[PDB]
């Protein structure tokens, strides 16, 4: 369903199809819709429309009264109401549905997004920090100032948040597996080779996590337990990079094992949202103002760019942790990535 945003001056209105836009791989999801303006107030007053890719990392007026502000990683510009001779050679089916239900004054717009823009992702705040903020987002405005598109202001500017969520490649990549050995203080017997063999690389929202963990044993230091705990990496790039480890979901059974041979259990994790709902510090996919979101997708960084990628660069991992007599809490980690499938 289409939705409009209206300014209290009933001058500009913006009609759009979807707030969530699909970041395809080969392409992006472009914007469609129209801007409906009224001609009586708008006499020789020329409207524009824009797409601001933006990066928020704190307070509005505070971090501004310094030497810098948010780096708008991108800003689109296209000229509405006086179209230099009417140049929308392709219109859109949404615009076809809008132009005829709405009046003769509706002005179409359409926004190509450069894909060197990361996604709309925000940190999960603490419980106690009240005025603290950060996150990447995509917003779009309709506006007009008397001065040409370079200068702009408020009061006619019509806001709207949108999103650009990332989507998965066809290729999953390798068969990632960790299988390795440790060395000790008071049992030189080798006690744990451990093979966290797996089945897939890039999952989606609702496909469980079976870790085929094959322990190899020689004798001593009886192992108590083996938990499998999914490690979300909460990346931040503000002035330094930053992770905040915290397990989204972790499960375990008491399958106990013996000295001088090999065991193997498949341990199955399911990371849910509503179980980590009302919890601190879990990167979630963006939302539309109240509507139900999910856990954040893994963000990936391009293989060499000029400027380091700033934002929440979400990644995950199944940490595989054990408890061993008399209770050493010991594990390992791997790489693996969570994304979307793309309409």
């Amino acid at each position: 369903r289409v939705f409009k945003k209206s300014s209290p001056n009933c001058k500009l209105t913006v009609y759009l199809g979807k707030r969530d836009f699909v970041d395809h791989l080969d392409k992006v999801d472009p914007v469609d819709g129209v801007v409906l303006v009224d001609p009586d107030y708008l006499k020789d007053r020329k409207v524009f429309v824009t797409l601001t890719c933006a990066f928020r990392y704190g307070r509005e007026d505070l971090d501004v009264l310094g030497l810098s502000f948010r780096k708008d990683l991108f800003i689109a510009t296209y000229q509405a109401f006086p179209p230099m001779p009417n140049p929308p050679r392709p219109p859109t089916r949404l615009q076809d549905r809008l132009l005829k239900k709405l009046g003769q004054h509706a002005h179409p717009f359409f926004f190509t997004i450069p894909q060197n823009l990361p996604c709309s992702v925000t940190l999960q705040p603490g419980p106690e920090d009240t005025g603290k903020a950060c996150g990447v987002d995509f917003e779009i405005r309709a506006f007009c100032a008397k001065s040409i598109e370079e200068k702009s202001h408020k009061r006619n500017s019509v806001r709207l948040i949108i999103r650009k969520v990332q989507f998965a490649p066809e290729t999953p990549g390798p068969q990632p597996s960790a299988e390795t050995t440790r060395h000790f203080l008071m049992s030189d017997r080798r006690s744990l080779h451990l093979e966290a063999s797996l089945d897939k690389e890039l999952y989606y929202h609702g496909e469980p996590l079976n870790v085929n963990v094959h322990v190899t044993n020689n004798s001593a230091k009886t192992v108590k337990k083996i938990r499998v705990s999914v490690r979300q990496y909460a990346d931040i790039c503000l002035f330094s990079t930053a992770q905040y480890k915290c397990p989204v979901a972790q499960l375990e059974q008491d399958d106990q094992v013996s000295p001088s041979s090999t065991f193997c259990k498949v341990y199955t994790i399911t990371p849910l949202l509503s179980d980590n709902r009302e919890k601190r510090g879990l990167a979630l996919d963006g939302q539309l103002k109240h509507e139900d979101t999910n856990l954040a997708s893994s963000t990936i960084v391009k293989e060499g760019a000029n400027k380091e990628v700033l934002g929440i660069l979400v990644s995950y991992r199944v940490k595989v942790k054990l408890v061993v007599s008399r209770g050493g809490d010991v594990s390992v980690e791997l790489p693996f990535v969570l994304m979307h499938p793309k309409p």
Partner: peptide, 13 residues
């Protein structure tokens, strides 16, 4: 120097 502050965005039908 930049943009400004807010007040709405909620309902969608």
């Amino acid at each position: 120097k930049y943009s400004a502050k807010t007040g709405l965005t909620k309902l969608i039908d």
